[PDB]
Design a protein around this motif. Structure first.
Motif, short mmCIF file in Angstrom:
data_model
loop_
_atom_site.label_atom_id
_atom_site.label_comp_id
_atom_site.label_asym_id
_atom_site.label_seq_id
_atom_site.Cartn_x
_atom_site.Cartn_y
_atom_site.Cartn_z
N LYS C 194 45.77 44.39 37.46
CA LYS C 194 46.42 44.42 36.18
C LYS C 194 47.76 43.74 36.34
O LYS C 194 48.79 44.38 36.38
CB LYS C 194 46.58 45.87 35.74
CG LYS C 194 45.31 46.71 35.85
CD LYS C 194 44.50 46.72 34.56
CE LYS C 194 43.78 48.05 34.36
NZ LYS C 194 43.46 48.30 32.91
N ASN C 195 47.75 42.41 36.45
CA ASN C 195 48.97 41.64 36.69
C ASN C 195 50.14 41.96 35.76
O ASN C 195 51.26 42.13 36.23
CB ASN C 195 48.68 40.13 36.64
CG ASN C 195 48.27 39.56 37.99
OD1 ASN C 195 48.71 40.04 39.04
ND2 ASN C 195 47.41 38.53 37.97
N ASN C 196 49.87 42.06 34.45
CA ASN C 196 50.89 42.04 33.38
C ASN C 196 50.97 43.34 32.56
O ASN C 196 49.98 43.72 31.96
CB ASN C 196 50.56 40.90 32.40
CG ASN C 196 50.40 39.55 33.08
OD1 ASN C 196 50.49 39.43 34.30
ND2 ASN C 196 50.15 38.52 32.28
N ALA C 263 46.22 34.93 31.65
CA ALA C 263 45.80 34.84 33.05
C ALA C 263 45.70 33.41 33.56
O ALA C 263 45.82 33.18 34.76
CB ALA C 263 44.50 35.58 33.26
N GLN C 268 52.89 35.02 33.04
CA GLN C 268 52.93 36.48 33.22
C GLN C 268 53.79 37.25 32.20
O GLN C 268 54.97 37.01 32.10
CB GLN C 268 53.39 36.84 34.64
CG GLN C 268 53.22 38.31 35.00
CD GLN C 268 53.40 38.58 36.48
OE1 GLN C 268 53.99 37.77 37.20
NE2 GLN C 268 52.89 39.71 36.95
N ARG C 291 43.85 41.58 32.42
CA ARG C 291 45.17 41.05 32.75
C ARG C 291 46.26 42.05 32.40
O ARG C 291 46.63 42.83 33.26
CB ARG C 291 45.40 39.72 32.06
#
Lengths: 437, 94, 442, 94
Positions: C194-196, C263, C268, C291
């Protein structure tokens, strides 16, 4: 300001070696440059040997513009320029996929911030700035019919892409794979639709066929067949296919329709598929379903270890095995509202940071010195514009006593990396959960 | 080619550092403005090659501000005249 | 007519010095001009020295067009022209970000209203009007306040408020927290899955506040070496243009409250969107649930509220009454959590404060006693005076005008007697002001 | 070059102020119109330099109206003829 090669790190400290060898007090871009040609073996070092710039020629220009030599050496620091130059090499490597900085990047980083002493050594040694970035470059580099059109990116070729030996494991869902094939042969409900709670696994099933057709056992005519993936370019590429048909399409998210060929594997949810067959009836026809059971608990485990290496990217894993055992088992029964391979991975990440996070936290009751420190500098400024020098220089000699003071409890905080750097076991994992349950 | 420049240092200590060298045939004056310290350099008679040279050094320790020099002469805050570098070296290098 | 530099104010009074040195009775644009070249040190002063216009050359043209010298000096005032010329310099500085007027702007302001005596001195001293506005210009310029780095160009351009920047010169408010809230962001941001991150709560809790949080900590400095060296920022034909000029620069994190090339690049985000609106985006799915990824923003602990107020208390002194009173703030806050009762516990407060944060500066400005009537009277007068003056009825005005200002000074004397309605209320604050505001909300 | 002009004053007192000076070889006449007062100046024989000069002063106290002068002569309101400045100075400067 981070971590580079030995070659980088050596070349940098090597600037300091040169900082003093001439007696100066701040190491500017001119010393970083001496640093590079003087470790004589870095790609950076190598390049300079090209332009015609040995240590001999350079240091002569430099001493011809600074010379001795206040042995002061009162524990020196950088030039602000050179600090920029370092901040830059970090970026001159983002700009190269180079996961870590090194001798070249620093040479790259100097040219970029050309305002400074190095730059002039060379515009003086008759070596314009671009002839130089060139030499470094020329010492680094890189790594089909209808594919022409398709082969945008959109949408990368699972097949030849994993023909290049370049493919991993991959753990299934081993009988998940083969059901993608009873369907992908038929003439009845032909095109298979991959329904299962989202993920991961799912994308891994098609990376399967890929693996299967290629090496190599498969059947009812399926060889030399690619699996491909991911509006003003729409049905454009799609005609490179009605004219050659070695190709399954892998979808993520629509139907421009079985106007003919079009072999595709379905990315959709328990219900999302009922958002096709109701309006019907290409579904009960072309497209046809199959489910992703949640991968085997034990299979679940030896799935991470494969991407263990690749998250080693944040500092702790690889390891511990005893660390993963956690992630996976916790999820299967202890909430327990996802899919048995996706969940685990997520958990790691919480900790797949939460440890480099807890790693770079803040020292003891050592807050109030910062506050003290603050006003001193302040007190210093006011007087210098009043000047009042001595009556301040007092105050500088005084701010600085407090500087190196706090450091030796912040550099004394790599005393804190140890107590968690690459430490990993369930310890970290499950406390994660006290929340989620 | 122009022979007078105005440079901005981020923090004052950057200026002390610069001081610890050789000014050389260089009149120089130092202002305080927007909390950042600007420094005004004036080369009397030097070959263009000789100045593009020298100025190199300076910007290891500063950047060159687009600032109209007369904005300072009016609305700045003077700190040291003519021999601006020289004076800091006195009260600060050891 | 306001406040300028010394140099300004000196040059201005200096016009008067010249007003009399020649004996004239109104200081026109010609004296403002003498004022500038005779303080000899203003940017204005400096410019004139350029065109070839010392005090010597000028005053000779001027005396060659007016000369002595009714020593009258009966407490003089401006020319209406010059009063225009002053009004102008104020604008010739709005037009320069110069927060305050000064020697230059007044010289700028003269050229602009070229009809008048100064202007002719020069169109007489063979110095067209534009050659002059030039000389002043070539003695002011840009700023470059930002230090840097290439890619920032297309980006820092747009749009869109570089939070790392506002957190660099430390020209940034605290702000409180939601301190354990700022942390939960960095997990969700130090990942790969879950990058963001995406903050959901009433909108309300000035979610946007937590974001300034990173700026400060990514700088100095408690954050993974996994994130050091990055930048926080915020926010049609300017399409994929600048966004291309960013994927090509990984060091970027972004803020939204409202698109998705998700993504794809290192693009980001950090998202601020309602309790539900998010329901209406992962509902989009499933690059969403993937994402981007959320955290619960709290309606601050009631006391926490109070502290936020004070930190920007010193900054609402802008509307003339604060700092203080603490005892009053506590009410702004406290009443809101329990009594109506329709927002977040930090927006509510500040709104009470602002309702009052002009309101009292206002009870200051109200019309004096029923002396609304005087002005009413004075009117009928001008007319008689005026209309009479058209008939003449001359000395039938002399005393009529005089009958007028008799009135006026009486008016203005009781119109400025309401500086007392100021010392009574202005800079007040206590509670009672608020509780009013409150009862006037239910 | 033209030697007759029509100027508008915002408030009447602006005209009194103008009066307190020297008209000089200048016939002048004063109208009332649209509540604002127009003033009509007529220089007999003066050098162009001499008039561009003089007119400068006037516009410290007025502005120059685009107003057709015959619009006044017809549809205006006369107040003082020929010696318009001169008369206000009588009844108003002290």
């Amino acid at each position: 300001f981070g971590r580079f090669t030995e070659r980088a790190q050596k070349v940098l400290a090597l600037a300091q070696e040169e900082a003093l060898r001439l007696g100066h007090n701040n190491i500017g871009t001119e010393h970083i440059l001496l640093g590079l040609v003087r470790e004589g073996e870095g790609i950076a070092a190598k390049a300079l040997q090209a332009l015609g710039l040995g240590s001999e020629k350079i240091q002569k220009e430099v001493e011809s513009l600074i010379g001795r030599g206040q042995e002061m050496s009162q524990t020196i620091h950088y030039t602000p320029r050179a600090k920029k130059v370092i901040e830059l090499s970090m970026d001159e490597a983002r700009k190269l996929g180079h996961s870590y900085v090194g001798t070249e990047h620093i040479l790259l980083g100097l040219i970029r911030e050309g305002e400074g002493v190095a730059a002039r050594v060379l515009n003086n040694l008759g070596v314009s700035l671009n002839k130089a970035r060139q030499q470094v470059l020329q010492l680094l580099g890189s790594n089909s019919n209808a594919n022409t059109p398709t082969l945008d990116s959109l949408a990368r070729d699972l097949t030849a892409i994993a023909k290049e030996d370049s493919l991993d494991p991959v753990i299934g869902r081993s009988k998940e794979i083969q059901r993608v094939i009873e369907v992908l042969s038929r003439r009845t409900k032909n095109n298979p639709v991959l329904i299962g709670e989202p993920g991961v696994g799912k994308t891994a099933i098609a990376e399967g066929l890929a693996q299967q057709i290629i090496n190599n056992e498969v059947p009812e005519i399926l060889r030399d067949k690619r699996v491909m993936t991911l509006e003003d370019r729409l049905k454009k590429v799609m005609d490179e296919i009605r004219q050659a048909g070695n190709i399954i399409l892998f979808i993520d998210a629509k139907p421009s329709l079985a106007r003919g060929e079009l072999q595709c594997i379905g990315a959709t949810t328990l219900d999302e598929y009922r958002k096709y067959i109701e309006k019907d009836a290409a579904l009960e026809r072309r497209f046809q379903p199959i489910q992703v059971d949640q991968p085997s608990v034990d299979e679940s485990i030896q799935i991470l270890q494969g991407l263990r290496d690749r998250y080693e990217a944040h500092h702790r894993v690889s390891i511990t095995d005893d660390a993963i055992e956690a992630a996976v088992k916790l999820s299967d029964r202890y909430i327990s509202d996802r899919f048995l391979p996706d969940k685990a991975i997520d958990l790691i990440d919480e900790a797949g940071s939460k440890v480099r996070l807890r790693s770079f936290t803040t020292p003891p009751n050592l807050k109030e010195l910062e506050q003290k420190l603050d006003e001193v500098r302040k007190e210093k400024d006011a007087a210098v514009q009043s000047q009042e020098f001595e009556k301040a220089a007092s105050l500088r000699d005084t701010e600085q006593r407090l500087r190196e003071q706090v450091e030796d409890t912040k550099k004394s905080w790599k005393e804190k990396q140890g107590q968690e750097n690459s430490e990993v076991t369930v310890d970290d994992i499950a406390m994660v959960v006290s929340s989620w349950t | 080619q122009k022979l007078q420049f105005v440079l901005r240092f981020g923090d004052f200590e950057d200026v002390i550092s610069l001081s610890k060298l050789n000014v050389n045939g260089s009149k120089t004056t130092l202002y305080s403005f927007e909390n950042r310290y600007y420094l005004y350099v004036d080369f009397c008679n030097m070959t263009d090659e000789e100045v593009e040279n020298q100025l190199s050094i300076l910007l290891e320790y500063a950047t060159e501000s687009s600032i109209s020099i007369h904005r300072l002469e009016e609305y700045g805050k003077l700190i040291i005249s003519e021999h601006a570098l020289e004076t800091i070296k006195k009260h600060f290098a050891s």
